[PDB]
Design a binder for this molecule. Structure first.
Ligand SMILES: Cc1cc(Oc2ccc(CC(=O)N3CCN(C)C(=O)C3)cc2)ccc1C#N
Length: 188
């Protein structure tokens, strides 16, 4: 077959019930996740190949960057609660990996302030139990799939993307192969 288990994707030994349709995991310390966001724009191209009525979910992970890694998972919960993911994703990536100006929770907060989120607005969200719940959801989703590496994408709680089995000759070709695989698994 053109799409084969173990080539473009793998099948989870224990599928996860009630999982988001398309679940994406990343870390702001993750180098390929940087490429996935700024160079390849994976999630955008995936969204454009899925049907218009399908939910896409992106979660941060703790297992990279120690203390700051957990701060960034809580900050991503704040971004999701305020709906400002598209304003802070790039400055958080570059603050961690390019300029290396993000070294504390205060530095993370500065990114939101510079992006236009008011100080009281950010601090209220940061300390809200709604964000506490959103951090728990990010943790449970990763723990449900025994996640130990990022970037990672899971389709319908049973299929995991395998970008290693795709062509990296051409970056545009890799993205389309990736997005077509998600669409194929979505229709499975
Ligand atoms: C064209 C291209 C293609 C790429 O392909 C990947 C993608 C993801 C991975 C997986 C990975 O990095 N992980 C997750 C699993 N584990 C256990 C880890 O430790 C680390 C590898 C190559 C990466 C970057 C670029 C670029 N520009």
């Amino acid at each position: 077959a053109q799409y084969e288990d173990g080539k473009q994707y793998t099948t989870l030994e224990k599928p996860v019930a009630g999982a988001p349709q398309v679940l994406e995991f990343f870390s702001f310390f993750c180098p390929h996740c940087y490429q996935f966001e700024e160079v390849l724009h994976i999630s955008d191209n995936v969204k454009k190949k899925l049907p218009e009525g399908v939910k896409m979910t992106k979660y941060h992970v703790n297992f990279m960057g120690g203390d700051l890694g957990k701060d960034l998972t809580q900050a991503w919960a704040v971004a999701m609660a305020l709906g400002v993911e598209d304003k802070v994703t790039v400055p958080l990536f570059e603050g961690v990996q390019k300029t290396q100006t993000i070294r504390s929770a205060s530095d993370i907060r500065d990114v939101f302030i510079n992006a236009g989120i008011k100080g009281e607005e950010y601090d209220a969200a940061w300390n809200s139990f709604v964000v506490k719940s959103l951090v728990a959801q990010q943790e449970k989703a990763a723990a449900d799939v025994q996640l130990r590496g990022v970037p990672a994408m899971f389709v319908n709680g049973k299929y995991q993307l395998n970008p290693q089995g795709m062509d990296t000759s051409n970056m545009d070709v890799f993205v389309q192969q990736y997005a077509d695989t998600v669409k194929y698994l979505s229709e499975k």
